[PDB]
Amino acid sequence: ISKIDKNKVRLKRHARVRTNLSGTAEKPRLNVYRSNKHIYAQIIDDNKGVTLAQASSKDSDIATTATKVELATKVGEAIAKKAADKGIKEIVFDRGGYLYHGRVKALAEAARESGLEF
Amino acid sequence: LKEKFNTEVTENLMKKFNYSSVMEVPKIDKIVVNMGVGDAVQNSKVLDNAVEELELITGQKPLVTKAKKSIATFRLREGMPIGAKVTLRGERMYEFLDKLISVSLPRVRDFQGVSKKAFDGRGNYTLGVKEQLIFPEIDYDKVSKVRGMDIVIVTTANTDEEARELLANFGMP
């Protein structure tokens, strides 16, 4: 037997996802990465290959002991506030290789609640 | 009664092998209990019966494997459910095994019991069963056809001899 690691499988699934998913500086990508203890969010124009905003669950602006889910709610709220200054329009949500469920759904709903038009 | 194994990690293996850390100890993962054909021309009732038999053997509902091809040399096609299994993982695995090896050679009537080696070289058993030491909750009081099982222990072990050292934990070597 051998235990398959989770992140390479995630990367395969993410590659299959990102084939009709790109950031074009008016719908920019909202990439999500969750490891095991945090979550991270980037906002990228894929056409230039340039990220624009960033938020994380280990950033000291949002770091407490809630759930990993209300944490994710804060990460979504933070990235919505950070991108709220400019280009806060319709974006495209890239969930990585992850289910739209649990932590990722929480951060997506939090980002959607607070101005982002996806 | 799992904690006996939680002694066996160093009762033999950190003794006889002396690994660098307790993470690299061999460890048994899954139990697969592949039932048999019971060729369901009329034995669909016997299929249901043997499935219920394996239910009484193990508290998980079995999965009914169908035939993988439409071969000759047998009347079979795609579909045609011709096997059952249960994957045992945890407390069901330990609770099954600790109960099983207590009664197993007691109803096997054998000195050596299985073989010193039936192994593949990766710490996998390929074990055969004549089906008597099982059904100790509902006996032969209602079943007609005897059965037999194919049970393989798969481990995190990498070789057959470390499977023997894990088979020093109430085994038939």
């Binding site: - | 508290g59 998980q60 609770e95 600790d98 109960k99 009537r109 000195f111 050596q112 100790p136 909750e137």
Partner: protein, 59 residues
Amino acid sequence: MKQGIHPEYHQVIFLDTTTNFKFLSGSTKTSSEMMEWEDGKEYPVIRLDISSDSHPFYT
């Protein structure tokens, strides 16, 4: 963990007179004649066998 289809197994006392390995389970729920508390305080129905006295190897 799918409720309903699984057979009711439960930790009934498999306590032999030979070392009393009462950590097994199943549906052999007889009348709870012995409820040993450090063992399973349940049906005792596996109360005696040749389990840990005379194995055909380990007699």
